[PDB]
Amino acid sequence: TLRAAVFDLDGVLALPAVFGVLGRTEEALALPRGLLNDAFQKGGPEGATTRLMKGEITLSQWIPLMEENCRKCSETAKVCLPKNFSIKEIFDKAISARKINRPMLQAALMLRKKGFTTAILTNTWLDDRAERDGLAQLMCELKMHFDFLIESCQVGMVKPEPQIYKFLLDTLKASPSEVVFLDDIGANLKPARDLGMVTILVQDTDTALKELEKVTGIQLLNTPAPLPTSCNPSDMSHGYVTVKPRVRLHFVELGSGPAVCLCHGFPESWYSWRYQIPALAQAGYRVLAMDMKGYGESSAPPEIEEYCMEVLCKEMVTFLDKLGLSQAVFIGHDWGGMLVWYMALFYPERVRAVASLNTPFIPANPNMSPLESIKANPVFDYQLYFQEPGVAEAELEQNLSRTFKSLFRASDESVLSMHKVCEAGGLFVNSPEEPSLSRMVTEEEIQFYVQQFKKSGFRGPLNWYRNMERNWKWACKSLGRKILIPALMVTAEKDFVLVPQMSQHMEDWIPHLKRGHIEDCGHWTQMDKPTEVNQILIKWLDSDAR
Amino acid sequence: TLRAAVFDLDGVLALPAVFGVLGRTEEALALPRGLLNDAFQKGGPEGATTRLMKGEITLSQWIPLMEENCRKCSETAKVCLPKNFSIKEIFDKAISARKINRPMLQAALMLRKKGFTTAILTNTWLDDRAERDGLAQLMCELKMHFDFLIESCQVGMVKPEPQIYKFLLDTLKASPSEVVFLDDIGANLKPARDLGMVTILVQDTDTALKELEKVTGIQLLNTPAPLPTSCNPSDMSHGYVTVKPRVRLHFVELGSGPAVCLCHGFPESWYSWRYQIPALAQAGYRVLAMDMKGYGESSAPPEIEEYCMEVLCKEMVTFLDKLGLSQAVFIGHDWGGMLVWYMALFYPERVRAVASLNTPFIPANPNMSPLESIKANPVFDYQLYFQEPGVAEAELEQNLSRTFKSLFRASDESVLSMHKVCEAGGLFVNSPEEPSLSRMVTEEEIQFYVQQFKKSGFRGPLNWYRNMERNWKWACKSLGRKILIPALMVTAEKDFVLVPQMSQHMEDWIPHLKRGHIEDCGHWTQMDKPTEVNQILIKWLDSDAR
Ligand SMILES: O=C1CN(Cc2ccccc2)c2ccccc2N1
Ligand SMILES: O=C1CN(Cc2ccccc2)c2ccccc2N1
Ligand SMILES: [Mg+2]
Ligand SMILES: [Mg+2]
């Protein structure tokens, strides 16, 4: 029956309410109780505050009217305002004190996710204050989670007037009884209740959610921890840079602040960072999530040497040159992780800081060809399989859905061993035709990867493994250097290929290395443990990259 | 005969040379003359400094070797180093003191422009210092102007070794006598001279340029002021954002720092900002140059109301939402200028600051339909011509090269009046079939616009003029507000349509308005007077947007 949920902002999605601050200021300053609220409401429908809420005037224009209203209320109550009495001040402090009320947002999310239409309905203002950006950020964070945000000052109408409710019902394409509306102000619910909307008077958050649960019949309170925000591909800004004539790089870009360049592994995609992108943007970074060379919408030339580490690094440098970035933070996973260490080693001036998921830094052995070194560790055998052009391509392209569903699995869901892959004659020889869906991924997400890899297949991606000798020789030029820029190594407990112990000597070459460690985390770190990855990255960025 | 020019960096393209600082430090600190230079050169080809210049070790690793070398030189000269003696300190100060030597760069540019291949050949290091970004910026600014930058630490070879010269000749695809090489160090010229290169020992900049001029036969010294750096379309990062299902916006993106969104007028393109984009990036801004709705690679739906100012503004807001920008600076010219004022009026929270070229802010008259207001000013008659769907499209599309060559003219080159356009029956009725090329634009630049407008023609662009009544009604909601965010109005003396006097009352509605004024500047402000536009914008950004 209920098909939509509408949330007030002040006192419902954002806390403390600002009327909250009018009460406290009065008391703090020992004024007559409600004086500030009387000055605020003065003139009712024709007073300064309604003009503000309707968008007739801006917040900077209203500030001095509210002042006058405060003088008038104080003369009529026969008191004096203190020296230094400042409406601008009180409101600045009140607006910056209000934060997102997380459990209300998470209930709104859950309702959206079971197919509700959701909106925010708020009496708010055109904010031209010096400090306006703080509230602009808050509104951006909330708004991306709802179908509509309706602001009194944008539509020229205010709660409790009945026209904003008709405007509400009409934007929702729903009828009065299909709608629940939560607000902390009883007067605002009245007209909704009159048209026959379910309404909830919001005092403490928990009781409201209990009423919302009872009325919608969906579980909202005490729900398990939700995933971080993911990305919809078609809502992202997509960027394209030609680094040389045959070769363009594609990337998805979100956020502002220091540039952070995310470099995925094999066989992945910018989308492998879907859970990191909004979190790092929200944390104040400019995220740039690559399709690396060979993948997705980046170019995929056929030749093997287009994919040696030297060329790949030079082209990441060109990518920065053409974007006009003197530096970025480089964060890599798997093959991308190897590449970011080599960026730190060959272009420290271009790298603000470097971090790797799973891939350790282990200096080349100048007395052992890497092809030989690889034979000494049974879990790397899959790399030998990858050598012969064509063999891995045929298997991996043969059925794309099967390929990614077989690969993208949590550590207890595995369907293949990386073990005697050559002997067995394939990565999938003893795995199902139709694997079950890992808990880590939805069917839709698998089909994103399938559609990406339909553009170029596995030749470019596999070529990353086809330059052993060439990479070894390049790496050897670097054996006298150390990595002395800010660096983070994140190991994953249950990565049975890129095992945490392989990283054990990294402090020899990177003396100031910082670490995180994720327990119960397989090879696909970002989607296995997105919440922990986000927390470890954001903390290290804020302390070392800022 | 000469086909290439090679410039050293330290002491040639960048000044003061850092050997410069070794001399001064010695004297400042009353040490034995040359002690610091001896410590620096110690061990010659096998000493610490060569390892550094070859890329074997990083700058942070070399610092303490140089220290040791300074202790050793001082004991052998029988003196003591002062308390607080700091190699890191001296070098930090020396590196940040060096700036681009502008007249050498401009000579290099001119030589490139007459078809020389140009390169930088430098002994330099892998720079992992905390403060590395300063030099990274300097190298980015220089490098974008040359065919090659060859660094000793990237190629594993050093001047004066003869292999870097062979590596040089081979990268240039030229022979010894086709090459001029400028360096401030005589030893470096020797091997070039041995292979038969022209060389120039660089002491004072002017004498070197006089030698370079004499030898190349091109005028380099006392040349007129050059244009700002322009943009090559295919070297830019191109971004695409879907703001709603039928509609994507394209933009070119360069630089990092506060987002600055450039909004061109009619009938233009992101490319109309070609001279501003590198300058604002170089000044520390993140430039976003739009194709506005209806143009270039942005969507161009056919319906008129898709182009009213309300819709256009809402979609610029969505563009910010999807890019994750809580604000941008909005700078507009012509129609883009009108739009940025309306962004300031309806979304101040999203606008960090607002500036307009040519387009004034004049509040709507609520007692006169704008269609009528327009009839009262003969220079706006071209807007009436634009009203009837199809009529202007047929004329403007009929011959694209003629259209833009007729429009894009400096103030003394005009070939049409905006005067009785309806009566005459066309914008071009009394103008040439094949106009001559304005001094403002090359043939290639005209053909960029021609190819852009081949994608969608003039329907979307002309529709910006087709919502008078709708825009008037929207604007009237704003008649109580003022613009109180930071704002800049730049008038152009010889814009005979958007005349400077039309802006005269703007302080009534924008009390803190700042101004610039450009003399001898027609309607096409950015390409008419790019140098002055850049200076006025960069100065106002640095003081009000930062
Ligand atoms: O394909 C490869 C390339 N190499 C050497 C290399 C050296 C330096 C940089 C990139 C690659 C490698 C080294 C270790 C494990 C696996 C591999 N697999
Ligand atoms: O096409 C137009 C639209 N209007 C009104 C308008 C009002 C507000 C915002 C955009 C447009 C206009 C006003 C003045 C000069 C020329 C024009 N030409
Ligand atoms: Mg409220
Ligand atoms: Mg020099």
From Swiss-Prot, chains A, B:
Active site: D334, Y465, H523
UniProt note on regulation of activity: Inhibited by 1-(1-acetylpiperidin-4-yl)-3-(4-(trifl uoromethoxy)phenyl)urea (TPAU), 1-cyclohexyl-3-dodecylurea (CDU), 12-(3-adamantan-1-yl-ureido)-dodecanoic acid (AUDA), 1-((3S, 5S, 7S)-adamantan-1-yl)-3-(5-(2-(2-ethoxyethoxy) ethoxy)pentyl)urea (AEPU), N-adamantyl-N[']-cyclohexyl urea (ACU), 4-(((1S, 4S)-4-(3-((3S, 5S, 7S)-adamantan-1-yl) ureido)cyclohexyl)oxy)benzoic acid (c-AUCB), 4-(((1R, 4R)-4-(3-((3S, 5S, 7S)-adamantan-1-yl)ureido)cyclohexyl)oxy)benzoic acid (t-AUCB), 4-(((1R, 4R)-4-(3-(4(trifluoromethoxy)phenyl)ureido)cyclohexyl)oxy)benzoic acid (t-TAUCB) and to a lesser extent by 8-(3-((3S, 5S, 7S)-adamantan-1-yl)ureido) octanoic acid (AUOA).
All copies of domain AB hydrolase-1, residue ranges: 258-530
Start and end residues of each stretch annotated as Epoxide hydrolase: 234-546
Pfam name, any one: Abhydrolase_1
Phenotype when changing R102C: Decreased phosphatase activity; no effect on epoxyde hydrolase activity
GO biological process terms held by the UniProt record: cholesterol homeostasis; dephosphorylation; epoxide metabolic process; phospholipid dephosphorylation; positive regulation of gene expression; regulation of cell growth; regulation of cholesterol metabolic process; response to toxic substance
Keywords tagged on the record: Acetylation, Aromatic hydrocarbons catabolism, Cytoplasm, Detoxification, Hydrolase, Lipid metabolism, Lipoprotein, Magnesium, Metal-binding, Multifunctional enzyme, Peroxisome, Phosphoprotein
Compartments it resides in: Cytoplasm; Peroxisome
Family annotation (InterPro entries): AB_hydrolase_1, AB_hydrolase_fold, Epox_hydrolase-like, HAD-like_sf, HAD-SF_hydro_IA, HAD-SF_ppase_IA/epoxid_hydro_N, HAD_sf, PGP-like_dom2
Effect upon mutating C521S: Loss of S-(15-deoxy-Delta12,14-prostaglandin J2-9-yl)cysteine-induced inhibition of epoxide hydrolase activity
Residues with Phosphoserine modification: S369
UniProt superkingdom: Eukaryota
GO molecular function per UniProt: 10-hydroxy-9-(phosphonooxy)octadecanoate phosphatase activity; epoxide hydrolase activity; lipid phosphatase activity; lysophosphatidic acid phosphatase activity; magnesium ion binding; phosphatase activity; protein homodimerization activity; toxic substance binding
Catalysed conversion reaction: an epoxide + H2O = an ethanediol; (9S,10S)-10-hydroxy-9-(phosphooxy)octadecanoate + H2O = (9S,10S)-9,10-dihydroxyoctadecanoate + phosphate; 12-phosphooxy-(9Z)-octadecenoate + H2O = 12-hydroxy-(9Z)-octadecenoate + phosphate; 12-phosphooxy-(9E)-octadecenoate + H2O = 12-hydroxy-(9E)-octadecenoate + phosphate
Entry EC no(s): 3.3.2.10, 3.1.3.76
Residues with PTM N6-succinyllysine: K54, K420, K454
Lipid-bearing positions (S-(15-deoxy-Delta12,14-prostaglandin J2-9-yl)cysteine): C521
Chain positions recorded as Mg(2+) binding sites: D8, D10, D184
Modified residue annotations for N6-acetyllysine: K42, K190, K214
Positions bound to phosphate: T122, N123
Entry-linked NCBIfam families: HAD-1A3-hyp (TIGR02247), HAD-SF-IA-v3 (TIGR01509)
Function: Bifunctional enzyme. The C-terminal domain has epoxide hydrolase activity and acts on epoxides (alkene oxides, oxiranes) and arene oxides. Plays a role in xenobiotic metabolism by degrading potentially toxic epoxides. Also determines steady-state levels of physiological mediators. Bifunctional enzyme. The N-terminal domain has lipid phosphatase activity, with the highest activity towards threo-9,10-phosphonooxy-hydroxy-octadecanoic acid, followed by erythro-9,10-phosphonooxy-hydroxy-octadecanoic acid, 12-phosphonooxy-octadec-9Z-enoic acid and 12-phosphonooxy-octadec-9E-enoic acid. Has phosphatase activity toward lyso-glycerophospholipids with also some lower activity toward lysolipids of sphingolipid and isoprenoid phosphates.
UniProt free text on domains: The N-terminal domain has phosphatase activity. The C-terminal domain has epoxide hydrolase activity.
Quaternary data: Homodimer.
The protein, known as: Bifunctional epoxide hydrolase 2
Biological source species: Homo sapiens
